[PDB]
């Protein structure tokens, strides 16, 4: 998954039909509850795999900060694991010890039996709870950006990013409850495959081109080179700080030549393009501030509100904003937060 992927929890609080709330939230993206201390099995967890596309699985803590208790629960939790997926999760949000350092070791030794099982580990739980209850920093410590923190606001089952839980280390972050258990991807998977370059750049007069291994460089198309997509025009160059239209859709080549993905700056104007490229037209917000921007014939442009208050202020070419604000009522739009 990356930045601003959407992705649902489940339980069996959520039942063995949770094709309902995947249609509402428009991905099939699931972490799904396998177990709880030694002895209990999520039942509907055969079901809502079928009915889904799991990125990972969760284990809901009882071990307080009993270590050896977590290795039991770990073992648990990892002897059913239905699949292969990048990511398995604790859930520590109840029944913590007395010892905040019992608790984060006992912490420390699940996520480290996560690891050595080949699976990346992730510590869930809420702000005030971490705080009182462990040392999240000897957990990131040891696992860095693990962390998918809850921080629902008025729960209200939009994300809400006054209310975006201020914690180092989130790679993920679950916005509400309401109807249903709803998360956003704040960080792109690691990505612990090396890509090779099958050539080398060579820089003339004129630009970049590529010579590949057999001799021959790319032209008039994208390649993808080092895990990266350019495009190439026409002399074998690759495109560098411009905008290309590409079967109806706009794409962006940046400044490295790299086609552009999420957020970019173009000039002082701010661009959305989705994960394959693609520019995204009409309402996008990211963190606190609404952007609408439009590709009509080519002309782009990018409507900035600045949020002041409980108001967002359209900002003019000039860089002024309106004396009153533009807008309280939020836009129901595209919600980014990275």
């Known amino acids: 998954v990356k930045k601003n992927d959407l992705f649902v929890d489940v339980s069996s609080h959520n039942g063995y039909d949770i094709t309902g709330i995947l249609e509402q939230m428009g991905t099939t993206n699931t972490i799904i509850k396998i177990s709880e201390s030694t002895t209990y099995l999520n039942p509907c967890l055969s079901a809502q795999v079928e009915q889904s596309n799991p990125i990972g699985f969760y284990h809901f803590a009882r071990f307080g900060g009993d270590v050896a208790e977590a290795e039991r629960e770990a073992q648990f939790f990892l002897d059913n694991v239905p ?5 398995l999760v604790l859930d520590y949000q109840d029944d913590p010890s007395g010892d ?23 510590y869930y739980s809420y702000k005030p709870f971490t705080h009182d209850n462990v040392d999240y920093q000897q957990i990131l410590a040891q696992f860095p950006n693990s962390l998918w923190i809850a921080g629902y606001g008025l729960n209200d089952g939009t994300a809400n990013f006054e209310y975006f839980p201020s914690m ?3 790679r993920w972050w679950q916005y509400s409850s309401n109807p249903f258990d709803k ?6 998977d690691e990505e612990d495959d090396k890509p090779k370059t ?15 291994n057999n001799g021959s460089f790319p032209y008039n198309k994208w390649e993808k080179i080092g895990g990266v997509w350019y495009y190439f025009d026409s ?18 080549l940046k400044d490295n030549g790299a086609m552009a993905t999420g957020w970019v700056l173009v000039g002082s104007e701010w661009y959305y393009m989705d994960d394959s490229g693609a520019m995204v037209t009409g309402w996008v ?27 967002w ?14 807008f309280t009522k939020e836009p129901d739009g595209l919600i980014t937060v990275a």
Request: aromatic share 18%; proline share 2%.
């Open 285 to 311: 917000k990211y963190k606190n501030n609404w952007y609408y921007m439009t590709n009509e014939r080519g002309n782009m442009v990018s409507n900035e509100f600045i949020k002041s208050g409980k108001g």
């Open 313 to 326: 202020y359209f900002m003019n070419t000039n860089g002024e904003l309106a004396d009153n604000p533009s």
């Open 83 to 87: 699949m292969q997926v990048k990511y």
């Open 235 to 252: 002399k074998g160059y690759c495109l560098t700080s411009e905008w290309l239209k590409d079967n109806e859709k706009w794409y962006y």
């Open 198 to 212: 099958a050539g080398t750049w060579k820089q003339d007069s004129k630009g970049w081109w590529f010579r590949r």
């Open 183 to 188: 998360n956003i991807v704040l960080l792109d």
């Open 168 to 170: 180092d280390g989130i």
């Open 100 to 122: 905040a350092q019992a608790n984060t070791n006992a912490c420390l030794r699940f996520m480290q039996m996560i690891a050595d099982a080949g699976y990346k580990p992730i």
